[PDB]
Amino acid sequence: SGVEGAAFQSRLPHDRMTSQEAACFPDIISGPQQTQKVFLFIRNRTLQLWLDNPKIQLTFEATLQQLEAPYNSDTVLVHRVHSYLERHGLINFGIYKRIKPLPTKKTGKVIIIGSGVSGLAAARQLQSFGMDVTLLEARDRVGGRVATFRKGNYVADLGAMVVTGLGGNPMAVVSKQVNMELAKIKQKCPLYEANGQAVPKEKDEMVEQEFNRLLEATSYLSHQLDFNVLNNKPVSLGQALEVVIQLQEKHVKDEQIEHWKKIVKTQEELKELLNKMVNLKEKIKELHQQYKEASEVKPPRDITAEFLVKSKHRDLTALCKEYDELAETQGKLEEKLQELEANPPSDVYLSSRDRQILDWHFANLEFANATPLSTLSLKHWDQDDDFEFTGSHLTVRNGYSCVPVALAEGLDIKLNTAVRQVRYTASGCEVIAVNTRSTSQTFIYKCDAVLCTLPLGVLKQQPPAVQFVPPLPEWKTSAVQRMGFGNLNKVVLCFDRVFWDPSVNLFGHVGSTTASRGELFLFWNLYKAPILLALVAGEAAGIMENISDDVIVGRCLAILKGIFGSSAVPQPKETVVSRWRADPWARGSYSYVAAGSSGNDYDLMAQPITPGPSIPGAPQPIPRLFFAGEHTIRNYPATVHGALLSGLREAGRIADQFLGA
């Protein structure tokens, strides 16, 4: 439906109020069911009006004129709902033409560290709300980990490049606001073994299915066998897959032993039967000799001599009957023994070729999580799964940077300004920063509040890139330690001509060892100009950063030559290699749910810091230091949309604190 789709597109249950709405409308959620339904319709309809045209500001006055009775009768209720949606960034976020131009009386001063997407989204909101906002950016550009290479006609993304499903995704609204050339990613992805030959269709499917079953199995291992701690340490997805694979290899050997044991039991039953026959044959042989001697006593004979012939005769036919039955049983057993000898269970769980293809699927997962599987929390690594959007994944053909660049229009952004120190007190904050081009030029920024959107990699640095005075409390630094910050790199290859399959957006290279499974394992055809992207995932990410570009490009061309032929692959005209772990403004690619961590650490990351009183015995200070970024949003970590959402969240939180709700 329509108002129902608006709720779904806003990641909201249409028939129930959220925790956040309860907080702002406690009178309604604690009240009768009828008013809750009126509220829910007002909310869903206001969302719909915004979504149905997100290029212009949805004002309260405009909203009321479009509501119909009975819902437009409590105008206080409508105004409250509208302002709630506006403040929390569910309507009038991103880039929209403003009806009422921004009032000149600016209230409050906020410094935002970082002008990636989270920092930018917050800044736009905070400006919309009337605050004075300045962003401090270390790099010479906006976007952070949204980073588009551009040279000539070549456009290729070194960071984020995929928009997940548009259903429920706030990037959908942004894509109606910015010219993004979104294109579906066809998921078909042929694999080529290390020798350049394609993986036959039978094997690609057998192993993908086994890969999926191995994952299920670890989840069984996690939930049903409570196998979550081993040797006093948290179990990882990697360990669990080892244990599952070891047990499938064990079951194959158990099945082999059971099989040959049925052969031994049967051979032995046959040995005992044969021994019974050679003895019976000898007994028959000797008895026949007796019958022969007795019947050669020519008649006329007395009746004992006759009894001897006739009873040896009878005794002999009985033994022959006994032997004929034992030979019928010998055929029944030589049957079982030949059927068994022809039904041997599987020889191996996975062949070497199998295991290598399986490793490509593991590398593909190491890609998705930007980390070796031995670091992923078995219990929690797929906790954001029940929030996946609906729809096809897409790429940004004109380069994802079009989004942060667009968001930056109109904001006060100081580029080439590396924050070194964040000072926060009961009376306000001071951010000390330097010019990255001459670190001696020092800058002091005084403000009411600091929104920190530094990447989790930067927060993790020892010794620190950015000092907090006073230091961050233990509950926050402990979260920063536990959370994973992973790594993932790309090689952009610009050719003058297309030698790959044009109707194929992905193809895989199957590395020959487990160790190297992440090394150039996947290639992307995403752009208009002939460009291939190559991924380095897992353990290979960090190791390939200490290898020169010329060698990395060399390894690529070697792989592609094997798949497409040596004559078909010219030298690239341009090449770029990302090194995200070494990037001091990133120190990795995105967060992952590490063993020993969990979803609650993402909440901890988002909790703002409140300084102590200046004067002792003085009233409780307000919070001064806020946090956003992909590492701060439990349900959508490690994404652009997750970062965007986290900025919208904090802007609402900051504005609630400094402008009043």
């Binding site: 070891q246 290899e249 050997k253 082999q256 050679v278 004992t304 006739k310």
Partner: protein, 132 residues
């Protein structure tokens, strides 16, 4: 509840995780275990192949022809004398006794046991059989 064709018992999980090298040890002992079962199959195949070679010829040089005799009702003296000896040797095995005489049904043998019980000391004869 594990996926079909996955095998994951609590028992086996602990056996493969209780130690740093538990897994490879477990699988090594199953490798040697399988080796010694295959070794044992080889010895029996060869033992049985030798036994089959002794049964070369079946029992065919030793099977007599199967004669049928019209089951007659009258007891010749010679047929009575065969029964008494067959009792002495086979006891109450009425079938074997019939097969020896040739032309006497199982029942006819049974009837013989009573009608000539007195005159042939059949009781003494059965006692005589039970000694050896």
């Amino acid at each position: 509840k594990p996926p079909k064709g996955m095998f994951l018992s609590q028992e086996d999980v602990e056996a493969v995780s209780a130690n740093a090298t538990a897994a490879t040890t477990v699988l090594r002992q199953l490798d040697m275990e399988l080796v010694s079962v295959k070794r044992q199959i080889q010895n029996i195949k060869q033992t049985n192949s030798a036994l089959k070679e002794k049964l070369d010829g079946g029992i065919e040089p030793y099977r007599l022809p199967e004669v049928i005799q019209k089951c007659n009702a009258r007891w010749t003296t010679e047929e009575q004398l065969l029964a008494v000896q067959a009792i002495r040797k086979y006891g109450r095995d009425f079938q074997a006794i019939s097969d020896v005489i040739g032309n006497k049904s199982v029942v006819q043998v049974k009837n013989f046991f009573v009608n000539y019980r007195r005159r042939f000391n059949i009781d003494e004869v059965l006692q005589e059989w039970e000694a050896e």
